[PDB]
Ligand binder design. Structure first.
Ligand code: HEM
Ligand code: HEM
Ligand SMILES: O=C(CNC(=O)C(F)(F)F)N[C@H](CS[C@H](Cc1ccccc1)C(=O)NCCc1cccnc1)Cc1ccccc1
Ligand SMILES: O=C(CNC(=O)C(F)(F)F)N[C@H](CS[C@H](Cc1ccccc1)C(=O)NCCc1cccnc1)Cc1ccccc1
Lengths: 438, 438
């Protein structure tokens, strides 16, 4: 029934099926479907997640309007995700004024100053990562990257969020598809006390927090925060910590795997990066905060990897009122979507876009890139609150790992890398590479 | 789970049962439960329709704050009623800016000027009401009032809304209880294309409207309206007409029955009213617009009946943001309720409140009544848009009916009147009275 909307608005798009919309086109993933629609339709098109109208926009002025200019007024919130339980109080899920408050209380936590104070604790677990890598390098047995990296990613998380310090390494799915064909079942589950975050994990940390709270990182800065608006609660403080672990876990690890695959399949870039790391940090010097920002080619590698593998795939905002933006009428309730992956690989902006070419982000060419076409961390008042931390975290990992080791493909290394057909931006097969000691 | 809210806020109220809240206390009706809570708790108290927190307020300053001062900002909408289908576009159901637009387009329809132009068409069907009454008066067979009145109420509706002219007389229930224990099933039904307004009635009028629309009252003024904002649609125009029929049907008839019962059980008031009607309209003169407003004692009878029988029972607003009003913090999502029936019978404001005493509204005493304690039509920007029309409609009915007939109780007349234990403000048994010709 709601499938007449875009037709009335005269916006092109694939014809929807009843009770499914256009969801059957997700068989090749969000990304392939985004690019095919970008090609066949042009600057704007609509489709239907079930009965939910989604409007893709690709014009950077319109993207700036949505993500920045009209954020507070119209496009404040992401599409209603649930069932979430108490995790409704987490910042990336909260809406309107509740989010606007949580953002203010959590923004000073992620300042450049606090991040610098976090570097030495991040610095220690690289040595763990190095020695755990050196144990597998002596063996030579080819390495699955998501393990060794995911262990390191966990080491940073538990340390940077709760002062807990562990050697972790030594110590489009069925449901969410059913969500968009039966989103009238979200409130069904909120009264059923079900949660996509098992009622045990949240229970574990909810009481684990109040142990550390009353026995005495992010938890510190957050506890210091609740010392205008209305300060911070105790259940809310737990929810944010959970959203920080989830955030920094499968993102820090996934990107670092994407980088090692790209460095291995481009040994020249690996050498030029190893040259820059050795020059600024002679004798495998311990990386510091300021030296990390000093390395431009390392930043060029990171951004180029994030261009080919934007973990988020898309950016979304719920249109809370009828609005006109840059000549286009958009009705209330519509989900406006910015196809990040499809823009990061648009030939109309990127020369040879399928190729890993760090020199696009050279200090010369970094000026030609539109910040509303390249958006690995989103943009506007509701961008990645942990952008600077994530970049610092990953760069500190790459530096110490390239001071000691070089990485070579193995016969099992999936060349070229095929992405996961599911709802996650991940490789089909895990990245397996050879680790050689310098 | 949501049952901890008021406890935290320190607001008193009945202790709720799981998965039911306090709904089992509706066995004696909304009204009896409201008065019992007013007595036992005082100025403010909360309770739970299932998991839904409802906050009753009784302080007129707070009532003015909710209904008037903070209407546009915070308390714009009534509690989400559904499943409604396309009737979501009807004004009494619409929310926020959509309602604010529908109100503007429909406000000039209900001006005092247009109402005066509607009187002669309303005047004609009183003669129908009189002659249909005279046929039953010759017989004398005691009369059930909701029939004869409901027929007249229909005659006004179809005439005042579509120019259709008929002699109609000659031509807390199970579901909504399940609504508040399973309100997570409202979106379940919106996708099931079910409706509490059968898919045939709405279908009947939706196509019946476009017949009269393309062949060529309220429909006229509305059609003239769609000739800023965005004008009016065709489906929306039908929805409003349906909400006008529903409005003016069981309300015009229910109140007029409540008035005849009260006039019959108080023959003195009936005589003093018949005296005023004869004096201003000698020789049973045809009532005019201006003469109706000239009659003060008739207005006193109407208001006093509406004090004892406020059809709406309660007034409700959904609190769309966290707010403080007159020293009381109110969290988001709470339903703020104004117990009209319980305030209209509060002895702390009304001397001998159970008694039918029109002299409370005498030009002398009408000054002492607080318009935030007496609210038969609500108050503020979202009051009864059809207040003036309804009063004019009912007064024109009473005048011509009292110029010709007098009304006496019968042995079957339920003295005293017992109200319906359900969710409607209606009598237990229908009102049966004796009709004598003057
Ligand atoms: C490579 C690493 C990361 C990438 C590429 C990334 C990217 C993004 C993107 C695209 C968004 C959505 C922006 C928008 O919708 O406009 C976002 C939001 C967010 N990110 Fe990240 N992120 C990364 C790491 C992190 C880390 C380490 C944290 C640690 C707390 C974090 C916390 C958040 C939060 C809380 C939000 C939601 C903010 C809000 O809703 O106000 N992210 N991120
Ligand atoms: C004895 C007759 C009537 C009584 C006692 C009455 C009373 C009320 C009350 C108490 C409200 C709610 C006010 C609030 O929540 O603040 C209301 C709203 C409303 N009434 Fe009436 N009413 C009567 C007749 C009518 C008639 C004849 C119409 C014809 C159109 C009508 C149309 C409406 C509408 C559309 C609303 C909702 C307005 C909005 O939501 O913006 N009513 N009425
Ligand atoms: O789009 C999708 C897929 N499918 C659907 O949602 C639909 F239901 F439709 F099927 N997932 C997300 C929205 S939930 C995501 C999971 C989460 C985890 C713990 C607690 C609560 C919630 C969350 O909120 N934070 C993650 C932290 C992060 C990760 C990466 C970068 N920065 C921060 C989209 C998203 C991505 C990035 C930022 C914000 C939102
Ligand atoms: O409260 C309750 C009972 N129970 C519950 O709602 C809960 F779901 F919770 F169980 N019903 C109403 C809210 S629906 C009511 C029905 C209706 C009819 C046709 C099309 C759509 C909707 C409507 O909207 N208009 C009526 C027109 C009117 C009648 C009388 C005076 N003026 C106007 C409360 C209400 C009363 C008065 C004005 C506004 C709202």
């Amino acid at each position: 029934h709601s499938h007449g909307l875009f037709k009335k608005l005269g916006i092109p798009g694939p014809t929807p099926l009843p009770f499914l919309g256009n969801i059957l086109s997700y068989h090749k993933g969000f990304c392939m479907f985004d690019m095919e629609c970008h090609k066949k339709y042009g600057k704007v098109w609509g489709f239907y997640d079930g009965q939910q109208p989604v409007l893709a926009i690709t014009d950077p002025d319109m993207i700036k309007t949505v993500l920045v200019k009209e954020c507070y007024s119209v496009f404040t919130n992401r599409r209603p995700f649930g069932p979430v339980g108490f995790m409704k109080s987490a910042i990336s899920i909260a809406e309107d004024e509740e989010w606007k408050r949580l953002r203010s209380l959590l923004s000073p936590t992620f300042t450049s100053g606090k991040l610098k104070e976090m570097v030495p604790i991040i610095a220690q677990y690289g040595d763990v990562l190095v020695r755990n890598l050196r144990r597998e390098a002596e063996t030579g047995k080819p390495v699955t990257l998501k393990d060794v990296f995911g262990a390191y990613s966990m080491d940073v998380i538990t340390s940077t969020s709760f002062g807990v310090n562990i050697d972790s390494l030594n110590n489009l799915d069925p449901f969410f598809l059913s969500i968009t064909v039966f989103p009238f079942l979200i409130p069904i589950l909120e009264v059923l006390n079900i949660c996509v975050f098992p009622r045990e994990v949240t229970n574990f940390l909810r009481k684990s927090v109040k142990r550390m709270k009353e026995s005495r990182d992010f938890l510190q800065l957050m506890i210091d925060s609740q010392n205008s608006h209305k300060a911070l609660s105790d259940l809310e403080l737990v929810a944010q910590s959970i959203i920080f672990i989830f955030a920094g876990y499968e993102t820090t690890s996934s990107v670092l795997s994407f980088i090692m695959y790209e460095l291995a399949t481009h040994p020249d870039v690996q050498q030029k990066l190893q040259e820059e790391i050795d020059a600024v940090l002679p004798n495998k010097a311990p990386p510091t905060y300021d030296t990390v920002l000093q390395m431009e080619y390392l930043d060029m590698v990171v951004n180029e990897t994030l261009r080919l593998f934007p973990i988020a795939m898309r950016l979304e905002r719920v249109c809370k009122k009828d609005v006109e933006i840059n000549g286009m009428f958009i009705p209330k309730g519509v989900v406006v979507m910015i196809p990040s992956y499809a823009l990061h690989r648009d030939p109309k902006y990127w020369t040879e876009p399928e190729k890993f070419l760090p020199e696009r982000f050279s200090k010369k060419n970094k000026d030609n890139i539109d910040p509303y076409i390249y958006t690995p961390f989103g943009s506007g008042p509701r961008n990645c609150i942990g952008m600077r931390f994530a970049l610092m975290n990953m760069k500190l990992a790459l530096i110490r790992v390239l001071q000691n080791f070089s990485f070579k493909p193995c016969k099992e290394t999936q060349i070229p890398l095929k992405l996961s057909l599911g709802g996650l931006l991940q490789p089909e097969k895990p990245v397996v590479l050879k680790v050689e000691s310098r």
